[PDB]
């Protein structure tokens, strides 16, 4: 079977740069029937190019692919932020069809603050039992970014989960999402709650709070 | 769009799945469907195919003896049947269309024929678990004077507690899709999955404008509608 792989795993630029994925087989590709495909976020794969070299319907004069026998390569001539996503070559000179593992493109861009708010918990929700503060940190982009939950100012740990976006598609930031979870009357014995953010576009840590209870 | 699939579903460990490609154009004509399948986080790897209009199929060694493909003309629709599911096979299966243009024939000229796929279902994720299904509790993540910034406020929906993967979320049915943000799910530690949709509008909309999240969880055979309105005082 032949073993696609691919280089770099993770290729880190900004937009405008160009991109050049590395694709080498571990034997010789017939015909050059080498593939690329583009896997963009929550999205199923997309044909870039076939034959190794020929773009296909409907894709853009920026990407081009290049190659023979073992060594094949896709370009990005001048990189967009929509580009953002896995790229994967396929081979199919010879049964079974296999994949490279594949090359991750991340856009670097520059730093911008996070737009943070906070939402206290449902009272439908907290009828049943559990209460979930959620804490909401929009379009930022160093991906870095610190979030500690206070409630009563007492600083929380061990019961937030958070996740992030990838990056935008539009705008190469990210948004995260911190969830505190408490139950019922642990969150009732309690008043103030309070989500405090750090990041590198923040000059200090900004806090969003809301006292429970209160309209 | 005109590749449509079956929907996510979780199955049993020994049991199989018939995973369904129906072409929209009401007809296979030449062309070949293949089946490639993707763990979450990972990468791509082809199972096999079938290409109707030659009564020809085959597929991938590391299936053998567990796969079968078919394709009826009557409904335009192609299947495959993975039998004897264990945990690994835990996965995204998309039907991916191929197609030959070898003068006339299914391949025979030119340089490279019919191993590419120009067009891709949306996936089904197959999820093999012994832990039985269950739908999402959706909860309102309301706009208020704590969610506002300049002349913007965010608001969304929490989608609780389901399993297992996945969950898809729209706005408005599909009308709103810019500031929309939907976070990957986390697994809690109760076993089941958690996530969340916000999306940013004009504040002077808030009145006048509904703002429905729809929560699709198929291995449930869920769908819940969520309106989420500023919370009264």
């Known amino acids: 079977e032949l073993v696609l792989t691919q280089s770099p795993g993770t290729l880190s630029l900004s937009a405008g740069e160009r991109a050049t994925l590395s694709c080498r087989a571990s034997?010789?590709?017939?015909?050059?029937?080498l593939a690329w495909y583009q896997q963009k976020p929550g999205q199923a794969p997309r044909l870039l190019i076939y034959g190794a070299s020929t773009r296909a319907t409907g894709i853009p004069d920026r990407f081009s692919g290049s190659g023979s026998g073992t060594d094949f390569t896709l370009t990005i001539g001048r990189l967009e932020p929509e580009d953002l996503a896995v790229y994967y070559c396929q081979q199919y000179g010879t049964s079974p069809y296999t994949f490279g593992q594949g090359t991750k493109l991340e856009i670097k861009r520059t730093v911008a603050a996070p737009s943070v708010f906070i939402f206290p918990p449902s009272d439908e929700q907290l009828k049943s039992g559990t209460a979930s503060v959620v804490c909401l940190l929009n379009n930022f982009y160093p991906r870095e970014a610190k979030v500690q939950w206070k409630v009563d100012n007492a600083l929380q740990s061990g019961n937030s989960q958070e996740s992030v976006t990838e990056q935008d598609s539009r705008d190469s930031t990210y948004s995260l999402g911190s969830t505190l979870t408490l139950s019922k009357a642990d969150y009732e014995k309690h008043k103030v709650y309070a989500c405090e953010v750090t990041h590198q576009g923040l000059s200090s840590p900004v806090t969003k709070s809301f006292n429970r209870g209160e309209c | 769009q005109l590749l449509e699939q079956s929907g996510a579903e979780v199955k049993k460990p020994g049991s199989s799945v018939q995973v369904s490609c129906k072409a929209s154009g009401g007809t296979f004509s030449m062309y070949g469907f293949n089946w490639v399948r993707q763990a979450p986080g990972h990468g791509l790897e082809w199972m096999g195919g079938?290409?109707?209009?030659?009564?020809?199929?085959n597929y991938a060694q590391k299936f053998r003896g567990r796969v079968t493909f078919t394709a009826d003309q009557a409904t335009s629709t192609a299947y495959m049947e993975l039998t004897n599911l264990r945990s690994d096979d835990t996965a995204v299966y998309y039907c991916?269309?191929?197609?030959?243009?070898?003068?006339?024939?299914?391949?025979?000229?030119?340089?490279?024929?019919?191993?590419?796929?120009?067009?891709w279902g949306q996936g089904t994720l197959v999820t093999v678990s012994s832990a039985s299904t269950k739908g999402p509790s959706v909860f309102p993540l309301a706009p208020s004077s704590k969610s506002t910034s300049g002349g913007t406020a965010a608001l969304g929906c929490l989608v609780k507690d389901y399993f297992p993967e996945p969950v898809t979320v729209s706005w408005n049915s599909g009308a709103l899709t810019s500031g929309v943000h939907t976070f990957p799910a986390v697994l809690q530690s109760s076993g089941l999955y958690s996530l969340s949709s916000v999306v940013t509008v004009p504040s002077s909309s808030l009145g006048t404008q509904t703002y429905i999240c729809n929560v699709n969880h198929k291995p449930s055979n869920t769908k819940v509608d969520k309106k989420v309105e500023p919370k009264s005082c």
């Open positions: 079938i290409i109707p209009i030659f009564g020809t199929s």
């Open positions: 991916a269309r191929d197609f030959g243009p070898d003068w006339e024939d299914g391949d025979s000229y030119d340089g490279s024929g019919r191993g590419f796929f120009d067009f």
């Open positions: 034997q010789s590709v017939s015909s050059g029937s």
